[PDB]
Amino acid sequence: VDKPPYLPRPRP
Amino acid sequence: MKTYVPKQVEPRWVLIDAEGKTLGRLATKIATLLRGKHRPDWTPNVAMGDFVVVVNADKIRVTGKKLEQKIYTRYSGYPGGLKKIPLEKMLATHPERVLEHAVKGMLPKGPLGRRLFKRLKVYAGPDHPHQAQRPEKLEV
Amino acid sequence: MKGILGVKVGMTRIFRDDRAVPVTVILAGPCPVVQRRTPEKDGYTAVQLGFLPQNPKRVNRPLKGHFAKAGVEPVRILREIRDFNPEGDTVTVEIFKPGERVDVTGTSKGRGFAGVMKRWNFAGGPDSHGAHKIHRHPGSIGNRKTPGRVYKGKKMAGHYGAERVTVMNLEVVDVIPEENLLLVKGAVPGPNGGLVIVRETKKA
Amino acid sequence: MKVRASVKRICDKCKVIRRHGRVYVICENPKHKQRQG
Amino acid sequence: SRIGRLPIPVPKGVSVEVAPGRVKVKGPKGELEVPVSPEMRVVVEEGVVRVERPSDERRHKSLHGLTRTLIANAVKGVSEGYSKELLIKGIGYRARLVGRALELTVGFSHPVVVEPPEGITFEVPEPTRVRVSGIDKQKVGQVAANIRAIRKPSAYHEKGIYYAGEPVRLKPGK
RNA sequence: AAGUCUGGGCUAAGUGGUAAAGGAUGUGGCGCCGCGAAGACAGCCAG
RNA sequence: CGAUGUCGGCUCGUCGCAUCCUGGGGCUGAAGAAGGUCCCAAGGGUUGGGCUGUUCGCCCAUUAAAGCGGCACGCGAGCUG
RNA sequence: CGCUGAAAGCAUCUAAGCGGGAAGCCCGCCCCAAGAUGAGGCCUCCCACGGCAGCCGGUAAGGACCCGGGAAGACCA
Ligand SMILES: [Mg+2]
Ligand SMILES: [Mg+2]
Ligand SMILES: [Mg+2]
Ligand SMILES: [Mg+2]
Ligand SMILES: [Mg+2]
Ligand SMILES: [Mg+2]
Ligand SMILES: [Mg+2]
Ligand SMILES: [Mg+2]
Ligand SMILES: [Mg+2]
Ligand SMILES: [Mg+2]
Ligand SMILES: [Mg+2]
Ligand SMILES: [Mg+2]
Ligand SMILES: [Mg+2]
Ligand SMILES: [Mg+2]
Ligand SMILES: [Mg+2]
Ligand SMILES: [Mg+2]
Ligand SMILES: [Mg+2]
Ligand SMILES: [Mg+2]
Ligand SMILES: [Mg+2]
Ligand SMILES: [Mg+2]
Ligand SMILES: [Mg+2]
Ligand SMILES: [Mg+2]
Ligand SMILES: [Mg+2]
Ligand SMILES: [Mg+2]
Ligand SMILES: [Mg+2]
Ligand SMILES: [Mg+2]
Ligand SMILES: [Mg+2]
Ligand SMILES: [Mg+2]
Ligand SMILES: [Mg+2]
Ligand SMILES: [Mg+2]
Ligand SMILES: [Mg+2]
Ligand SMILES: [Mg+2]
Ligand SMILES: [Mg+2]
Ligand SMILES: [Mg+2]
Ligand SMILES: [Mg+2]
Ligand SMILES: [Mg+2]
Ligand SMILES: [Mg+2]
Ligand SMILES: [Mg+2]
Ligand SMILES: [Mg+2]
Ligand SMILES: [Mg+2]
Ligand SMILES: [Mg+2]
Ligand SMILES: [Mg+2]
Ligand SMILES: [Mg+2]
Ligand SMILES: [Mg+2]
Ligand SMILES: [Mg+2]
Ligand SMILES: [Mg+2]
Ligand SMILES: [Mg+2]
Ligand SMILES: [Mg+2]
Ligand SMILES: [Mg+2]
Ligand SMILES: [Mg+2]
Ligand SMILES: [Mg+2]
Ligand SMILES: [Mg+2]
Ligand SMILES: [Mg+2]
Ligand SMILES: [Mg+2]
Ligand SMILES: [Mg+2]
Ligand SMILES: [Mg+2]
Ligand SMILES: [Mg+2]
Ligand SMILES: [Mg+2]
Ligand SMILES: [Mg+2]
Ligand SMILES: [Mg+2]
Ligand SMILES: [Mg+2]
Ligand SMILES: [Mg+2]
Ligand SMILES: [Mg+2]
Ligand SMILES: [Mg+2]
Ligand SMILES: [Mg+2]
Ligand SMILES: [Mg+2]
Ligand SMILES: [Mg+2]
Ligand SMILES: [Mg+2]
Ligand SMILES: [Mg+2]
Ligand SMILES: [Mg+2]
Ligand SMILES: [Mg+2]
Ligand SMILES: [Zn+2]
């Protein structure tokens, strides 16, 4: 069930 | 004056006829004999109880519907490895394990009680192979 | 419940009734009984069998004593057939007739440290579409914090083969007593030259 | 065999039996046979 | 309003000796041993056996009647013996005695063969009638029931194996 | 660690050792109506 | 909140049973065959496709059956993105 | 689903007792396994070696090392 992602995808 | 502590004494051997006795109530007494709490010089940190030989283990008796309802249990560590064995079968297959499993759970945990359980020699059927030790017959 | 030691020699096929029959040839006989296990002496019933002639130069003194108590020449391999008590002092291929049905125990070929795809027939990962260095990998081996561990027996990579395998209900296609041969229909574990055991089948 | 929490008599021929720790209802009419559960 | 109080008439010449927890009953047809609660007293008077209960408790009252009827049946068993008749209905359905054993032809793709257990005798007077006779009451009724079960009465047709004196109750088709 | 302590009773469900409407010849115990040796109830029969 | 990476897929499973199938039953407005409904049963099984990121769902062709749920909506120091 | 059977003169698979009954349960089949420290069993082999349940040393039955290898194998085994 599509719920909003709580973390951004990690950056360098 | 510091409390008396016994040096090692010769262990007494005892014989019990388990026939017709109530499982749990015979268990406690054997545990007691094993601990050595019947000796005035009891000391909790050493093995100074009696050696206890039990005969006619298969002829132990039990109240209520436990023969069908008491479930002994063993877990192997694998998935779905919980084995349930009812009392009926345990007596039918390894009867001496009944008195053994009972008495064991009434002994203290740890190194000592673990070695006390070794001083329990239980046999199903009227004969025991310890005539050499000349065991003293106990009424309990 | 009869039995006999032997060696796998190899496979061919023969023709029986306009039909090709894949067979494995086993050099079975002759097997000298060197000890009998008895319920009074050993608590169960079995017959210790010997197999293959041995150079007595290689047989140590403990072993030599054993062979003498049976009055039997030195032998390379000892194995027991349980619940078998032959009348004779020697077992040959004669105890099986063609048409009978047998179980063969052997040592499976060893695949050494085997991957999960060969060992456990896993399906592994994709070979394109982004698959990143996991083509022959197992994937997940568990859950999360509950239970937070791996099951005993969890199928993983590791050694595979060089292990005891018994194949059952194999038809005896022929027996050639003059050469101690046994012709069994189908596949038997192990390499050619590997040791096998041939027992009467326990199937119905 | 109707299984339910409320077992009762349906007709005057129905009979309430307690059998092996359970409350059954047996009767000449097969439709009325009940066990409590 | 009471069974176990009633005395058991004991015909001649059958013997009823009392033992701890059992009674032994001999007669012109054989012997029978009746297990009896230690709590119940079995008493042997002239040509009459009586059973007495130790109190008016619910358990003892139940054991009491049961004990009597148990011993009563054992007496009648060695004297008159017990028997049940089975009636066979249906077009192809027959029975025939193959030696001591009973063969049953009741519509299956094969015939059924029933062996007499110890103390049981099968007899086939007609083709559609079967008699199970023995000195043991429960053993007879059991063997009877077993033989009936082989092809129970239908609910739609007068077909199958019946008890004698067993009502044919059916329901309509279509 | 200290009672297999004493006396009276209940429970046979391991109830004790997690739950409700409702259901029930569980068991024991107090009542309350009927109907019965002017022969009741069960039934075992004649009609 | 001096970080417990968040859907779906893939992979690998394991459990629950309120059982989709197979096994065993009672009732049926159960003739038979086939169904209905409830009870017992978790041993095994539970297919391939088209649409869409989809889970889900619809559809094709089959099937004994194409079960429903838990495991951080199991599984990103295993992959995908 | 029954047989026999009281309490409850009848009835009742149950309160005494006994049957039948599932791919399920236990055994059975295949594999691991005595670190099963509860360390099992059988067959066979060596022995009363020197000096002072211990220490050093020389052996026995045996074993390891080393080497040629192996449908055994990462090393090891
Ligand atoms: Mg004492
Ligand atoms: Mg008890
Ligand atoms: Mg044992
Ligand atoms: Mg403590
Ligand atoms: Mg030929
Ligand atoms: Mg081998
Ligand atoms: Mg290899
Ligand atoms: Mg792999
Ligand atoms: Mg494989
Ligand atoms: Mg493959
Ligand atoms: Mg694949
Ligand atoms: Mg591939
Ligand atoms: Mg792909
Ligand atoms: Mg990438
Ligand atoms: Mg990458
Ligand atoms: Mg790549
Ligand atoms: Mg992976
Ligand atoms: Mg944990
Ligand atoms: Mg290996
Ligand atoms: Mg209602
Ligand atoms: Mg009404
Ligand atoms: Mg009725
Ligand atoms: Mg008399
Ligand atoms: Mg008197
Ligand atoms: Mg119809
Ligand atoms: Mg007391
Ligand atoms: Mg309960
Ligand atoms: Mg409890
Ligand atoms: Mg509880
Ligand atoms: Mg209530
Ligand atoms: Mg009530
Ligand atoms: Mg009445
Ligand atoms: Mg946070
Ligand atoms: Mg940090
Ligand atoms: Mg931190
Ligand atoms: Mg269920
Ligand atoms: Mg079915
Ligand atoms: Mg079904
Ligand atoms: Mg039908
Ligand atoms: Mg129809
Ligand atoms: Mg049905
Ligand atoms: Mg299942
Ligand atoms: Mg499972
Ligand atoms: Mg499942
Ligand atoms: Mg496509
Ligand atoms: Mg959708
Ligand atoms: Mg179909
Ligand atoms: Mg169908
Ligand atoms: Mg699909
Ligand atoms: Mg998730
Ligand atoms: Mg999910
Ligand atoms: Mg990642
Ligand atoms: Mg993901
Ligand atoms: Mg994760
Ligand atoms: Mg995830
Ligand atoms: Mg993770
Ligand atoms: Mg993207
Ligand atoms: Mg009856
Ligand atoms: Mg009973
Ligand atoms: Mg039975
Ligand atoms: Mg039974
Ligand atoms: Mg039956
Ligand atoms: Mg099968
Ligand atoms: Mg082995
Ligand atoms: Mg060992
Ligand atoms: Mg071993
Ligand atoms: Mg242990
Ligand atoms: Mg050993
Ligand atoms: Mg042994
Ligand atoms: Mg040497
Ligand atoms: Mg090498
Ligand atoms: Zn009714």
Q: CA distances (Å), C47 to each of B117, C41, C80, C85, D14, in order?
A: 39, 13, 6, 6, 69
Cβ neighbours around E153 below 10 Å, total: 20
Q: In angstroms, what is the span from residue E5 Cα to ligand 31's centroid?
A: 29
Cβ neighbours around E6 below 10 Å, total: 13
Rg (CA), chain A: 9
Cα–Cα distance between C105 and C20 in angstroms, integer? 24
Own/partner contacts of E21-30, CB < 8 Å, gap of 24 or more, are E23/E71, E23/E74, E25/E71, E25/E74, E25/E75, E25/E77, E25/E78, E26/E78, E27/E75, E27/E77, E27/E78, E27/E79, E27/E135, E28/E78, E28/E79, E29/E77, E29/E78, E29/E79, E29/E81, E29/E135, E30/E77, E30/E78, E30/E119, E30/E135
Nucleotide with minimal C1' distance from the CA of C158 is H74
Single-letter amino acid code for the residue at C132: H
Cα–Cα distance between E120 and E126 in angstroms, integer? 19
Cα–Cα distance between E157 and E170 in angstroms, integer? 7
Q: Are D31 and D3 in contact (CB under 8 A)?
A: no
Cα–Cα distance between E4 and E49 in angstroms, integer? 11
Q: In angstroms, what is the span from residue C124 Cα to ligand 50's centroid?
A: 21
B/e letters for D7-18, b = 16+ CB within 10 Å, e = fewer, are: beeeeeebeeee
For C126, what's the count of Cα atoms within 13 Å in the CB-facing half-sphere?
Answer: 5
The ligand whose atoms approach the alpha carbon of C61 most closely is: 70
Task: Give the mutation candidate from C149, C150, C152, C155 for the B interface (greatest B CB count, under 10 A).
Answer: C152
Determine contact: B78 vs chain C, CB below 8 A: yes
Query: Which residues on chain B are in Cβ contact (under 8 Å) with C142?
Result: none
What is the stated resolution of the deposited model, in angstroms? Answer: 3.1
Q: Residue D6 is encoded by which pair of tokens?
A: 């409320």
Q: Is the dihedral of CA E16, E17, E20, E22 positive or negative?
A: negative
Nucleotides of F under 7 A from a protein CB: 1, 4, 12-14, 20-28, 40-41
**What SS3 class is residue C156?**
coil
Torsion of CA C162, C166, C171, C176, to 10 degrees: 60
Q: What angle do CA D13, D15, D20 make, to 5 degrees?
A: 160
- Taking each helix axis from N to C end, the angle separating B23-35 and B96-105, rounded to the nearest 10 degrees, works out to 60
Q: Are E148 and E140 in contact (CB under 8 A)?
A: no
Q: Are B107 and B32 in contact (CB under 8 A)?
A: no
Q: How many cross-chain Cβ pairs, B to C, lie less than 8 Å apart?
A: 8
Q: In angstroms, what is the span from residue B79 Cα to ligand 44's centroid?
A: 14
Cα–Cα distance between B27 and B101 in angstroms, integer? 9
Residue nearest to nucleotide H30 (CA to C1'): C166
Q: In angstroms, what is the span from residue E170 Cα to ligand 48's centroid?
A: 28
Q: Is the dihedral of CA B116, B118, B124, B129 positive or negative?
A: negative
Q: Are E24 and E17 in contact (CB under 8 A)?
A: yes
Q: Could you tell me which residues come within 8 angstroms of residue E47 by beta carbon, excluding any fewer than 6 positions away?
A: E9, E10, E11, E12
Q: Residue E138 is encoded by which pair of tokens?
A: 């429960």
Q: Are C2 and C81 in contact (CB under 8 A)?
A: yes
**What SS3 class is residue B32?**
helix
The ligand whose atoms approach the alpha carbon of C120 most closely is: 9
**ω before E13 within 30° of 0 (cis)?**
yes
Question: CA C108 → C1' G66, Å?
Answer: 38
Single-letter amino acid code for the residue at C48: Q
The ligand whose atoms approach the alpha carbon of A2 most closely is: 50
Q: CA distances (Å), E126 to each of E81, E94, E97, in order?
A: 21, 9, 10
Q: Are B27 and B138 in contact (CB under 8 A)?
A: no
Nucleotides of G under 7 A from a protein CB: 3, 5-8, 10-16, 25-32, 38-40, 43, 53-55, 71-76, 78-81
Q: Could you tell me which residues come within 8 angstroms of residue E138 by beta carbon, excluding any fewer than 6 positions away?
A: none
Cα–Cα distance between B34 and B14 in angstroms, integer? 10
**Helix, strand, coil: what percent of chain A each, to 5?**
0, 0, 100
Nucleotide with minimal C1' distance from the CA of E1 is H9
Cα–Cα distance between C113 and C111 in angstroms, integer? 6
Bridge partners (DSSP) of residue B136 are: B14
Q: Residue B2 is encoded by which pair of tokens?
A: 């510091």
